[PDB]
Design an enzyme around this catalytic site. Structure first.
Site, mmCIF file in Angstrom:
data_model
loop_
_atom_site.group_PDB
_atom_site.id
_atom_site.type_symbol
_atom_site.label_atom_id
_atom_site.label_comp_id
_atom_site.label_asym_id
_atom_site.label_seq_id
_atom_site.Cartn_x
_atom_site.Cartn_y
_atom_site.Cartn_z
ATOM 1 N N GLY A 113 74.044 21.018 112.495
ATOM 2 C CA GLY A 113 74.667 21.357 111.211
ATOM 3 C C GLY A 113 76.572 22.083 112.087
ATOM 4 O O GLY A 113 76.926 22.063 110.527
ATOM 5 N N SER A 162 78.136 19.696 104.466
ATOM 6 C CA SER A 162 79.479 19.891 105.501
ATOM 7 C C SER A 162 78.675 20.286 107.032
ATOM 8 O O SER A 162 78.103 19.507 107.650
ATOM 9 C CB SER A 162 79.406 21.819 104.950
ATOM 10 O OG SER A 162 80.149 22.667 105.830
ATOM 11 N N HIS A 197 84.990 33.689 103.991
ATOM 12 C CA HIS A 197 84.104 33.233 102.849
ATOM 13 C C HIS A 197 83.064 32.912 102.585
ATOM 14 O O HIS A 197 81.902 33.403 102.612
ATOM 15 C CB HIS A 197 84.743 32.110 103.073
ATOM 16 C CG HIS A 197 84.090 30.276 103.902
ATOM 17 N ND1 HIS A 197 84.527 31.268 104.678
ATOM 18 C CD2 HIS A 197 82.681 29.748 103.614
ATOM 19 C CE1 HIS A 197 83.907 30.314 106.105
ATOM 20 N NE2 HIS A 197 82.734 29.795 105.425
ATOM 21 N N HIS A 228 81.029 35.335 105.508
ATOM 22 C CA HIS A 228 80.708 34.711 106.816
ATOM 23 C C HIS A 228 81.880 33.795 107.489
ATOM 24 O O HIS A 228 83.264 33.263 106.794
ATOM 25 C CB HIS A 228 79.005 34.062 107.389
ATOM 26 C CG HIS A 228 79.124 32.508 106.380
ATOM 27 N ND1 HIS A 228 79.250 32.340 105.219
ATOM 28 C CD2 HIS A 228 79.502 30.977 106.934
ATOM 29 C CE1 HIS A 228 80.154 31.122 104.506
ATOM 30 N NE2 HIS A 228 79.767 30.250 105.909
ATOM 31 N N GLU A 242 82.690 31.325 110.558
ATOM 32 C CA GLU A 242 81.959 29.148 110.980
ATOM 33 C C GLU A 242 81.795 29.726 111.968
ATOM 34 O O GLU A 242 81.981 31.308 113.069
ATOM 35 C CB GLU A 242 83.038 28.257 110.988
ATOM 36 C CG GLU A 242 83.414 27.432 109.872
ATOM 37 C CD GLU A 242 81.864 27.940 108.996
ATOM 38 O OE1 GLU A 242 80.957 26.664 109.371
ATOM 39 O OE2 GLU A 242 82.067 28.593 107.680
ATOM 40 N N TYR A 252 74.010 19.902 100.624
ATOM 41 C CA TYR A 252 73.548 21.240 100.260
ATOM 42 C C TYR A 252 72.950 21.173 98.902
ATOM 43 O O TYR A 252 74.214 20.782 98.488
ATOM 44 C CB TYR A 252 74.438 22.469 100.026
ATOM 45 C CG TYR A 252 74.150 23.538 101.821
ATOM 46 C CD1 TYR A 252 75.473 21.678 102.788
ATOM 47 C CD2 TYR A 252 73.536 23.863 102.436
ATOM 48 C CE1 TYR A 252 75.592 22.473 104.127
ATOM 49 C CE2 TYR A 252 73.633 24.649 103.061
ATOM 50 C CZ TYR A 252 75.030 23.793 104.163
ATOM 51 O OH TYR A 252 74.922 24.595 105.535
HETATM 52 O O1 LIG Z 1 77.678 25.200 100.285
HETATM 53 C C1 LIG Z 1 77.517 26.389 100.494
HETATM 54 O O2 LIG Z 1 76.358 26.637 100.540
HETATM 55 C C2 LIG Z 1 78.627 27.117 101.929
HETATM 56 C C3 LIG Z 1 79.354 26.263 102.425
HETATM 57 C C4 LIG Z 1 80.616 26.573 103.662
HETATM 58 O O3 LIG Z 1 80.248 27.649 104.174
HETATM 59 C C5 LIG Z 1 80.855 25.489 104.563
HETATM 60 O O4 LIG Z 1 81.971 25.970 105.612
HETATM 61 O O5 LIG Z 1 80.529 24.444 103.864
HETATM 62 NI NI NI Z 2 81.074 28.613 105.474
#
Ligand SMILES: O=C(O)CC[C@@H](O)C(=O)O
Ligand code: NI
Ligand SMILES: [Zn+2]
Lengths: 349, 12
Positions: free
Chosen positions: A164, A282, A270, A182, A184, A171
C-alpha cells in the site's frame, strides 16, 4: 504568492510534460500546488492505463469492510467490520442494488448534504486496501506500480516491502463509503487514480494549518488522544465540513472524476466519500522535500503493524552534512510548508 | 524492526 488562497489546483499536462513523473510534481509545486495539500491532475486525452475494464469481474476482494459509523453533530467514529471475500461482479451487484445505490440528486451540494445526513445509516461495504494494480504492464507514464521516486530507496536498500506504501492498493467503492481524516503514513505524498465509475469527493486542509485540525480533533476525542497522540492515523475519525468551518479550520473540497489523478502532499490532511460504484488505485511516493517531514512525522505506536520507515537511509544520502547531528538527536530544522521541493528550482528562474 | 508494517488499517 503562488496560490496564497491555498485552494486546490487542477493541472493539464501535455503528453511531453506527463512523461516524467517526479519532474511534473516538482513543477506543480513550483506553481504552489502543495499549499492546499491536495491537487488534481488530468492526464492528456491520449493516455490510458488500461484498454478495457471488462475483464476483472473475477477479481477477488479478500477482505471487504462494512463501515459502521457512530456519532452526531458532525463528529463521528468509523468501525470497519471485515466481511467474507467476494468478487468484483458480486460487489458491483450490491453497489448498484436498490439498497446501496446512489440516491437521486441535482447538484453536488445536495449529494454532499445527503452523505453527512445519512452516513450513520445503512452501513455500506467498501472493497478497500486490495493488493493489486489495473495498469497494463507496458504503461510507462504515471504507472502507480513504478513511479520511480526516491521512496524506492526503501525497497532497494532494505529490501523491505510495505504494501500500500511502496506497492499499489485498489479501492472498490459504493455510495456513502468513506475515508476518514488523515495524512499519509510517515507524512508521505500519495497518488490516487480513479480508474472508472462514479466520482470520489475530497476534503483537504492546507499543510500549514494541519496542527489546527489535530488540535481540534484532540479536543473532540480526548480519550482517543490520551491513548495515542497520532490517533488520527487509525483512520476512524470523521469530521464534517460544517464543523471545520465552525471552528475556523481552513479547507477546500474537490470532486475527482473517472480518469483523473489526485495527488496529496506531505502533511496534507484529507478525507472524503465515494458517490457510487467505482474503482481507484493508490500508493505513496516521495520527493526530496518529504525527507524533513518523514524525520518529524508523529507516529502511532499503540498498535502493531503500523507503517514505520527508518529515515536513516534518506538523511545519510541526501543530508550527509546534517547526518551526524541528526543521529545525536540535535537536528532542529523547522519545516516551511509553503516552500516547493528543491527539484522545482528548475522551473522558478 | 526499524522499517515495516502495512498500509491497511486494523479491521474489526
Ligand atoms: O480512496 C480512498 O479510500 C482514499 C484514498 C486517499 O486517502 C489517498 O491518499 O489515496
Ligand atoms: Ni490518503
Ligand atoms: Zn495509535
Amino acid at each position: 504568492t503562488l496560490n496564497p488562497s491555498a485552494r486546490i489546483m487542477t493541472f493539464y499536462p501535455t503528453m511531453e510534460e506527463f512523461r516524467n513523473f517526479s519532474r511534473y510534481i516538482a513543477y506543480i509545486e513550483s506553481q504552489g500546488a502543495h499549499r492546499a495539500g491536495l491537487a488534481k491532475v488530468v492526464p492528456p486525452k491520449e493516455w490510458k492505463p488500461r484498454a478495457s475494464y471488462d475483464d476483472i469481474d473475477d477479481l477477488v476482494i479478500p477482505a471487504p469492510i462494512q463501515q459502521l459509523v457512530t456519532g452526531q453533530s458532525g463528529l463521528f467514529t468509523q468501525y470497519n467490520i471485515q466481511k467474507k471475500a467476494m468478487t468484483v461482479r458480486e460487489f458491483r451487484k450490491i453497489a448498484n442494488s436498490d439498497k446501496y445505490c446512489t440516491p437521486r440528486y441535482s447538484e453536488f451540494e445536495e449529494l454532499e448534504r445527503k452523505y453527512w445526513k445519512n452516513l450513520t445509516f445503512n452501513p455500506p461495504i467498501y472493497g478497500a486496501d486490495v493488493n493489486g494494480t489495473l495498469y497494463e504492464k507496458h504503461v510507462d507514464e504515471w504507472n502507480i506500480g513504478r513511479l520511480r521516486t526516491i521512496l524506492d530507496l526503501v525497497e532497494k536498500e532494505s529490501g523491505i516491502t510495505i504494501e500500500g506504501v511502496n506497492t499499489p492498493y485498489l479501492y472498490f467503492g459504493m455510495w456513502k463509503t468513506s475515508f476518514a481524516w488523515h495524512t499519509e503514513d510517515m507524512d508521505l505524498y500519495s497518488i490516487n487514480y480513479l480508474h472508472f465509475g462514479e466520482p470520489k469527493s475530497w476534503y483537504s486542509v492546507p499543510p500549514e494549518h494541519g496542527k489546527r485540525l489535530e488540535r481540534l480533533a484532540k479536543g473532540f476525542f480526548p480519550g482517543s488522544a490520551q491513548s495515542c497522540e497520532a490517533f488520527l492515523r487509525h483512520k476512524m475519525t470523521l469530521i464534517s465540513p460544517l464543523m471545520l468551518k465552525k471552528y475556523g479550520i481552513p479547507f477546500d473540497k474537490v470532486t475527482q472524476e473517472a480518469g483523473e489523478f489526485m495527488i496529496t502532499f506531505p502533511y496534507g490532511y484529507h478525507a472524503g466519500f465515494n458517490h457510487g460504484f467505482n474503482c481507484a488505485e493508490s500508493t505513496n511516493f516521495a520527493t526530496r522535500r518529504w525527507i524533513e517531514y518523514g524525520k518529524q512525522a508523529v507516529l502511532c505506536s499503540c498498535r502493531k503493524d503500523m507503517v514505520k520507515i527508518s529515515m536513516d537511509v534518506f538523511v545519510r544520502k541526501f543530508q550527509p552534512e546534517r547526518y551526524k547531528l541528526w543521529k545525536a538527536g540535535k537536528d532542529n530544522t523547522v519545516i516551511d510548508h509553503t516552500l516547493p521541493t528543491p527539484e522545482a528550482a528548475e522551473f522558478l528562474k | 524492526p526499524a522499517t515495516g508494517g502495512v498500509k491497511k488499517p486494523h479491521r474489526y
